[PDB]
């Protein structure tokens, strides 16, 4: 089972893809997201992607299909070792503190064009000792339920 907070976060995530609010992600909407992240999938490629997570074969991703796909992806970052690997990706200079510049670098390389302000907000939410950066223990806390 997922936290009710995790399910709530996944709902907001789902809303970013389901731009029309119809309860489904279409090739058009997934295309729009992929293009915002700097990819150019063809209509064929977009249908291939939906197809593998489309349990009822209706050609769109509903929230239950999305949540199944996301819960499965979360297994890539659930072990001590996978969380350490993810920490090393973020902490580019190896000094044990994920800075705003580092978090923006990771997110930009993944295609997400964030504002300084969005980056500062994600740090603020993770930054428990309030030093303006995210350390390993903060990172583990933010990566587990």
């Amino acid at each position: 089972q997922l936290t009710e907070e995790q399910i709530a976060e996944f709902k907001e995530a789902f809303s970013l893809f389901d731009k029309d609010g119809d309860g489904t992600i279409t090739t058009k909407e997934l295309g729009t997201v992929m293009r915002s992240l700097g990819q150019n999938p063809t209509e064929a490629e977009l249908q291939d992607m939906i197809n593998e997570v489309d349990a009822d074969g209706n050609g769109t991703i509903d929230f239950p299909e999305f949540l199944t796909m996301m819960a499965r992806k979360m297994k890539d970052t659930d072990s001590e070792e996978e969380i350490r690997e993810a920490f090393r990706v973020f902490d580019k200079d190896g000094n044990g503190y994920i800075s705003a510049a580092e978090l923006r670098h990771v997110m930009t390389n993944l295609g997400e064009k964030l504002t300084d302000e969005e980056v500062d907000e994600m740090i603020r939410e993770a930054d428990i000792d309030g030093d303006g950066q995210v350390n390993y223990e903060e990172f583990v806390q933010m990566m587990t339920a």
């Binding site: 995790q6 995530a13 992929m34 990819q39 490629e45 992806k73 295609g111």
Partner: peptide, 28 residues
């Protein structure tokens, strides 16, 4: 940024999986 990260890496892996398919075809 936990969920944001797994979504963005999932978007990237949807893309690598589709590239890997066409690559499988080139190789075979």
């Amino acid at each position: 940024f936990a969920l944001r990260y797994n979504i963005l890496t999932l978007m990237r892996m949807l893309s690598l999986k589709s590239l890997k398919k066409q690559m499988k075809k080139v190789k075979k």
